[PDB]
Amino acid sequence: ESIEKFLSTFILPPLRDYKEFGPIQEIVRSPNMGNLRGKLIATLMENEPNSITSSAVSPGETPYLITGSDQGVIKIWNLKEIIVGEVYSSSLTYDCSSTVTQITMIPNFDAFAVSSKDGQIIVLKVNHYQQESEVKFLNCECIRKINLKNFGKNEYAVRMRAFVNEEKSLLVALTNLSRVIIFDIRTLERLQIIENSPRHGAVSSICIDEECCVLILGTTRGIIDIWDIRFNVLIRSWSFGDHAPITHVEVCQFYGKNSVIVVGGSSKTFLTIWNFVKGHCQYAFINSDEQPSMEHFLPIEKGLEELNFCGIRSLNALSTISVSNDKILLTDEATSSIVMFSLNELSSSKAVISPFSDVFIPTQVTANLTMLLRKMKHDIINSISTCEVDETPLLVACDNSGLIGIFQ
Numbered sequence: 001e002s003i004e005k006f007l008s009t010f011i012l013p014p015l016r017d018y019k020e021f022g023p024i025q026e027i028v029r030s031p032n033m034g035n036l037r038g039k040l041i042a043t044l045m046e047n048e049p050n051s052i053t054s055s056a057v058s059p060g061e062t063p064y065l066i067t068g069s070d071q072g073v074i075k076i077w078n079l080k081e082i083i084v085g086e087v088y089s090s091s092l093t094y095d096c097s098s099t100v101t102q103i104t105m106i107p108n109f110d111a112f113a114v115s116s117k118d119g120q121i122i123v124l125k126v127n128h129y130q131q132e133s134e135v136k137f138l139n140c141e142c143i144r145k146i147n148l149k150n151f152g153k154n155e156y157a158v159r160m161r162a163f164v165n166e167e168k169s170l171l172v173a174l175t176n177l178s179r180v181i182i183f184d185i186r187t188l189e190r191l192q193i194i195e196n197s198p199r200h201g202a203v204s205s206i207c208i209d210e211e212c213c214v215l216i217l218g219t220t221r222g223i224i225d226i227w228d229i230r231f232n233v234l235i236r237s238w239s240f241g242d243h244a245p246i247t248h249v250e251v252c253q254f255y256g257k258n259s260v261i262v263v264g265g266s267s268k269t270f271l272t273i274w275n276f277v278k279g280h281c282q283y284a285f286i287n288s289d290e291q292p293s294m295e296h297f298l299p300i301e302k303g304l305e306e307l308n309f310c311g312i313r314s315l316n317a318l319s320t321i322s323v324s325n326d327k328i329l330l331t332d333e334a335t336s337s338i339v340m341f342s343l344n345e346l347s348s349s350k351a352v353i354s355p356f357s358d359v360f361i362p363t364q365v366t367a368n369l370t371m372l373l374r375k376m377k378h379d380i381i382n383s384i385s386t387c388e389v390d391e392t393p394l395l396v397a398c399d400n401s402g403l404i405g406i407f408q
Helices: 079-083
Strands: 040-044 052-058 064-069 073-078 092-095 100-105 111-116 120-131 134-147 157-164 169-175 179-184 190-195 203-208 214-219 224-228 233-238 244-251 259-265 269-275 280-286 321-324 327-332 337-342 350-353 359-366 369-375 381-388 393-399 404-407
Touching: 040 079, 052 100, 052 381, 052 393, 064 100, 073 079, 073 100, 073 134, 079 393, 079 404, 092 134, 111 157, 157 203, 169 203, 203 259, 214 244, 214 259, 224 259, 244 321, 259 321, 269 327, 269 337, 321 381, 327 381
Parallel strands: 100 157, 203 244, 280 369
Antiparallel strands: 040 404, 052 064, 064 073, 073 092, 100 111, 111 120, 120 134, 157 169, 169 179, 179 190, 203 214, 214 224, 224 233, 244 259, 259 269, 269 280, 321 327, 327 337, 337 350, 359 369, 381 393, 393 404
C-alpha cells in the first residue's frame, strides 16, 4: 500500500482504488420481475415494533437486504439463507443511535450510505468471507462519516442518491431545509450546494439522471424543478394536474435518457412519465377507470409561485416504487396491493400481490400521451425492493410496524 495518492495533494484515484470499500462488483442485470408469482414465502418480525424507515438490496450471487429502523438500527439479511435455509434471523446488526432517514447503496460495492435525524451521514462497509463455499457475514464497518451541522444550519439529510462510474463518485443529499448538497464519496467533501426557491414549496423528492448531469427536484407544491449541476442553473420548472406534492421522482431508463417517473403532482394517478427535456407527459397511469382531461397533463410553467400547498390527502399518496428495466412495482395502500406495470406491454399490467383481479387498459389520448385506466374486479409499506436470488425474482416489502414480507 501507499497513501500519497489519497491525501489530495494533487486528483482521483477512482473509487474502485479505495480498498476500504472492498472490490468493485460485477454489474448484475435487472431482475426479471415479470415472472413474479406474488406468493408470500416469508415474514420476518425481528424489527417489530420499530418502523422500518428505509431499505435497499445489494444484488449478486449472495444478494442481501439492508433495513434501517426509526431507532437507528441497521440490519443485514442473507436473502438466500432466508429463502433456502429458512433461517429468519438477521445476519448482522449495526446501531446508528439515531432515526434512519435513508439507506443508499454505493453502486457495485458492498457499501451503503446511511443518513440519520441527528445530521450524521455514514458509509458502512459490509465485510464477509467464504465458509464451505457460502458467504458468511462478518460485520458492518463505518468507513466514512460527516455531520451536516458542519454546514452551520443544523441540517439533517432526509433523502439521498448515489452515482458512481469511472469518472464520478457522488453522494447527493437532500436536507430538511430543502437544500441539496453534493459530496464526493471518496472524501465526503462538499462539491456543490443547490438551493431551490422557497417560493416553490419545500423539496420533497430528488433523483439524478442517467448521466449524473442534472438534479430533478419535486416539491410540496407539485412542482418539478430541474437543475444543471455543473452550472447550478434552473433549466426546467413545471407543474400539472392539481399540483399535489411530488413524493417520488425516478429516471426511467426504459424510455430513454430524458424520461422521468413522477409520483404525485396529480392526485388522479399512480404515476406519470415525463420527457423532461421536451417538458411533456408521455404516460399517465390513472388510479381509477375515469380518465382525466388531456389538459390535466399539460405542463404549467407560469404562476408557480402562486400554487398553494394541498397536503397529503389520500392513502393513494403513499405509493412507494421499485423500477426494474421494463417493470414498475408500485404499492397501492388503498387496495392493499402491489401493482406491477409492464412498460413493455401496458395491457399486461396487474396487481401482482393483492387480496381482487384488476385489469389495466391503455388508451392513446393524443399522438404523444397514453393513459392507462384501471378497471376494478395490513400496515403501511414504507419501502419495496426487487432482485433475483438464483434467477427467480423476489420482492421485499418493509412496513411501518417493523415487519418484512418476502414474495416470490
